[PDB]
Each structure stands twice: as C-alpha cells, then as structure tokens.
Design a protein around this ligand. Structure first.
Ligand code: IMN
Ligand code: IMN
Lengths: 115, 116, 116, 115
C-alpha cells in the first residue's frame, strides 16, 4: 500500500468518516487524469488506492471532499475541498501517508513518508 | 482590499517573503481562468490583488507556490504548492484573508472572512 | 510592543474575541511567577502586555484560556488551555508575536520573532 | 490502552522518534503530579502509559520535550516543550490519542477520542 490517506475532524476530535477522496495523476498535456478514489472508513482512513506497480514517479493531486463532509454535519464550511499536490519520487521512503486535519474554516495537511 | 494573502514560515518563525501566488476563477465552461497574481512582501503579505468590482461571486483557487519558496532556502519540500479553493461573495461582498503556515512537509491554511 | 498575542477561531473563520491570556515567567526558585495578563480585542489581538524594560531574559509561559472561550460559544472543547512556553531575549531584546488557531479538539501555535 | 501519544516531524515528514513525553495528573493542591512517561518509538508513538483502572477522571498534562528533539537534529527551536492540558471524562469515548505535529517555530496538537 504505497499511498494512504488519513482524515481527522478537529471540531469533534474523531476520524472523519465517509469523506470522498479523489486522486489524479498529472498527464503530459498538464491536465489531471483520474487515478483512484474512495471514501474514508470508520477509522478515517483510505487504503488500497493503488499498487507499487502503478504508482510511478509523477505529480499527483489528492482531492478531499471536505465541503460535503461539513454539510452532512450541518456546519457551514469555507473550502470547496482540500487539495494536496506533490511529486512521487523513487529515491525517498516508499510509503506515503497524506493526512488532513479538518476545521470548517481551516485545514492542515501533512505527508508522512516512511519505509 | 477584498482578497489578501498572508504567509508564515514555521521553520524560521518569520513571514514567508517573496512567495508567488496565482489566483484563478472558475469560468462558466468549468475551467480555471487566471484572475490575479502577485508576490508576498517583507511582511509575508500580498495586497491589491483585485478590487471589489472585479471580485464577483464565484469559485476561486488561490495557488501559493510553496515548493519554489522552500527550494531557495535549500529545502526539498513535499508539496508542489498549496491550493486554497472556495466560493466567494455568494451572499454579497466579503473581505477574505487567506493565511498559510508553511513547513517543508506540512501546511495549514485558514480564512478570516469579514463583512464590510 | 515586544510581546503580542493573536488568536483566530478556525470554526467561524474570525478573530477569537475576548480570549483571556495569562503570561508567567519562571523565577529563580523554579516556580511560575505571574507576569502579565489581558484579553484579546475585536481583532483577536492582545497588545501592551509588557514593556521592553520589564520583558527581560527568561522562560515565559503564555496560557491562552481556550476552554472558557469555547464554552461561551456552546462548545465543549477538549483542552483546558493552550500553553506556549519559550526562552525569550536570550540573545538580546526581540519582538514576539504568539499566534494561535483554535478548534474545539485541536490548536496550532506559531511564533513570529523579529529583531528591533 | 486508554492514552496514546503520537508525534510527527513537519520538516522531515516522518514520525518524531525518541521524543521524551511526561504525563502529569493535577493533584488537589493544584500541583502537577508525575503520572507516566516514556520516549516515542520508531513509529513516533508512545503506548502503555497507563491502564483503564488508573486513568481516572481528572485534569492531565502531557509534556512533549520538543526542544531536545530539535537540538539533536541541529535545528534551533522556539518552544521549551509542547504542553497538552485536558480533562479526562468517563462519559465520552474511551481511547484518547494525543497527536502533535512539530515544526521548529510552530506546533499543532489534536485529540482523537474514540471507542
Ligand atoms: C486577521 O487575518 C489574519 C489571519 C491570520 C494571521 C494574521 C492575520 C496575522 C497578523 C498579520 O496580519 O500580520 C498572523 C501572524 N496570522 C497568522 O499567524 C496565521 C498564519 C497561518 C495560519 Cl493557517 C493561521 C494563522
Ligand atoms: C490516529 O493516528 C494518527 C493521528 C494523526 C496523524 C496520523 C495518525 C498520521 C499517519 C502517520 O503517522 O503515518 C498523520 C500524518 N497524522 C497527522 O498528520 C497529524 C495531523 C495533525 C496533528 Cl495536530 C497531529 C498529527
């Protein structure tokens, strides 16, 4: 599992569950090609997005649908979605965890890159 | 000034100076049209991007070029840039401050929205 | 103004207004002595806590009373308060801005330190 | 394991390893009583701090020695340590994860409280 996503909710202090996540890979014409998607689980996590064969070096974008998550909770959010854009590179450690901590008007995102 | 950008460096405890910022607006055909651009100053702030009249309702994308910034400090950062995407002015004109706190493998972004 | 405090609310996208702040300074006997206190204004800022002369070298603790703040908004927050603990002025006088971004179960704190 | 600590490093994008963590419980005279301590592991985590029998309701303080972590990396940090102060309460979910994301001049901390 070379690419994992973890989403937490900073208002409730819980995993953010059932959050839609879309991954895109940057194509040679600079457009964004759908690559992988899913919904976070009960633990706020999304696994099994891709395999080490398909996850080649390149620029990827992870798009976390935060606006629908907040609307389902009845809370009026600022952002359309959170967007994490990064280059996957074979030299460094192999596992990428993209984490996001969500508030209605703020979010943070971190990359944990390990072996 | 209805749209301003404020960038901090979380490694140096200082404003993030000369950070490039590109703003886009989603057009009717659903593409991102170039809306305004600039660089943060000595105070890590970017003002005068647009005017109330020009800053109409729509979905905006503020792209803060963090990777260029880090590289010139000799750091090799994780992200290409920070993207901040939001509906603006969809209940009448507001003032928006987009703030970003940068680390090489992390950033946070918040909005302060006030009513004229 | 050598020590100022800036507080944002990450749920409302607004300054955090009327947040109580207590600053302490570690004394020679190793206890926390009361140093200064105040409340954030309409802009979420707190100024005039101390003077350059009074703000000598030492270890300071800025306690931001976040739990009181959240409760008055009807929220039941996780933390009692944010604590920010740092050596100040140990290479000559500096200006410090302590910033905090509050959510009910999370906060972030950053320092902007500048040289007179 | 009612109380777990997770520490990440925002400059390297890795777990923060070998970080000392001291937990205190607030005594009736308002002083801080040492309660539990340890060092984060290779995965940036600290487990086995306490048991559900000893972790009674009360105010606790978790003190993460960030200054020594940054000094070991040769990086000049702002804070003496990060301090997470909170009330443990029996009504809510049972597992407390205190997470901290560290930069030299900034940190964030989040509580994930679950079942
Ligand atoms: C009211 O509008 C803002 C918003 C955020 C601000 C400031 C002003 C100032 C002060 C100034 O205007 O110079 C600082 C220092 N801000 C931050 O620290 C900051 C940076 C990034 C994040 Cl994610 C959260 C907060
Ligand atoms: C429940 O377990 C957690 C909790 C938080 C986590 C992670 C795992 C991972 C995954 C990992 O460690 O690989 C990351 C990246 N987390 C963060 O990003 C994070 C974000 C904000 C703060 Cl304030 C503190 C930590």
């Amino acid at each position: 599992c070379p690419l994992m996503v973890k989403v937490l909710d900073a208002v409730r202090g819980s995993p953010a569950i059932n959050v839609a996540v879309h991954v895109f890979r940057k194509a040679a014409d600079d457009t964004w090609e759908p690559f992988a998607s899913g919904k976070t689980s009960e633990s706020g996590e999304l696994h099994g997005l891709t395999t080490e064969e398909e996850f080649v070096e390149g620029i990827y974008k992870v798009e976390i649908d935060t606006k629908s998550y907040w609307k389902a909770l009845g809370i009026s959010p600022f952002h359309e979605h959170a967007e994490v854009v990064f280059t996957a590179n074979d030299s460094g450690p192999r596992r990428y965890t993209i984490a996001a901590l969500l508030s209605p008007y703020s979010y943070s995102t971190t990359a944990v890159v390990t072996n």
